[PDB]
């Protein structure tokens, strides 16, 4: 209720200000007179996406540290980070991060 109302107020103020900005100078009359598709940008977007997926898994790490199984949790967190590093290394050594 509070968050929805705050969002509505923010959007309403932004809309009001943009429309008044777009219509204040409209009252007075004036004169009123390709293909390339480079492959590297798609690859950086996909790398960001793959990395983003890895980011979600860790997200729970702050809570994962209270389990009484600290050894297993530490091992799996380090495994996830090592595999993220391995993805970065593989894309590095295969000329995936070049321009």
């Amino acid at each position: 209720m509070n968050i929805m109302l705050t969002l509505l107020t923010n959007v309403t103020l932004a809309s009001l200000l943009v429309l008044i900005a777009f219509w204040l100078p409209q009252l007075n009359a004036y004169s009123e007179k390709r293909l390339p598709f480079s492959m590297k940008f798609f690859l950086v977007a996909i790398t960001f996406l793959l990395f983003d997926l890895e980011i979600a898994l860790l997200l729970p790490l702050p809570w994962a540290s209270q389990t009484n199984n600290l050894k297993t949790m530490l091992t799996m967190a380090l495994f996830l980070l090592i595999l993220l590093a391995a993805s970065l290394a593989y894309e590095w050594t295969q000329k995936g991060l070049e321009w």
Binding site: Q66, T67, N68, L70, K71, L74, L78, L81
Partner: protein
Amino acid sequence: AGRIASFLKNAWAKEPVLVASFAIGGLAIILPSLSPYTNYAIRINRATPYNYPVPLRDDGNMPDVPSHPQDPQGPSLEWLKNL
């Protein structure tokens, strides 16, 4: 030995970021297996009561189970306090 030293000296020049990152990651992997405070962290996590401790029905054969928290028998947290 000598070749490893040459490789490390050649990498420490012109690639210091990678050397630092690999050293820090290797330490993060190795050191936890040797620290004596990891078991202390496990014990601290065990001592955090999230749930109500459900009492057990007394049957006349439970000497190690306290009848009151003030009783000497039962787990203590003096190691936690001294930490």
